[PDB]
């Protein structure tokens, strides 16, 4: 989901509730945030399921890639954020 852009901040949210933190990987390639999620076959309420996604976000030009950080909430939302340099 969301791509919030403040004057002095940068923040993107992603609903990854089906993936455990160990099943997710975030990589910063230049000005691109890459999020990869993959989980092997798992039983759920409906049957059995495996999933995989690869999401790419464009970072604003005024954001130092080195300052990008991330976090996961209890509600399974992944947030990637960084300070704006201007």
Author numbering: 66 to 151
Q: What's the paper's own text on this?
A:
Small Hsps (sHsps) form large oligomeric assemblies with a high capacity for holding onto nonnative proteins that are handed over to the ATP-driven chaperone machines for refolding. sHsps are ubiquitous among the kingdoms of life and within mammalian genomes occur in large families with members differentially expressed in many tissues including muscle, brain and the eye lens. Small Hsp sequences have in common an “α-crystallin domain” (ACD) of around 90 amino acids, with most having a short conserved C-terminal extension bearing an I-X-I motif and a longer variable N-terminal extension. The ACD is an immunoglobulin-like beta sandwich comprising strands β2–β9, and the assembly unit is a dimer. The conserved arginine in human sHsps is on the β6 + 7 strand at the dimer interface, not far from the dyad axis.
Here we have solved the X-ray structure of the ACD dimer of human αB R120G close to physiological pH, as well as higher-resolution αB ACD wild-type controls. Two mutations improved the diffraction resolution of crystals of human αB ACD: L137M substitution and truncation of the β2-strand. The sHsp wild-type ACD X-ray structures all have a deep groove that runs down the AP dimer interface. The groove is maintained through sequence changes, register shifts and across a wide pH range. The base of the groove is lined with four arginines, Arg120 and Arg116 on each of the β6 + 7 strands.
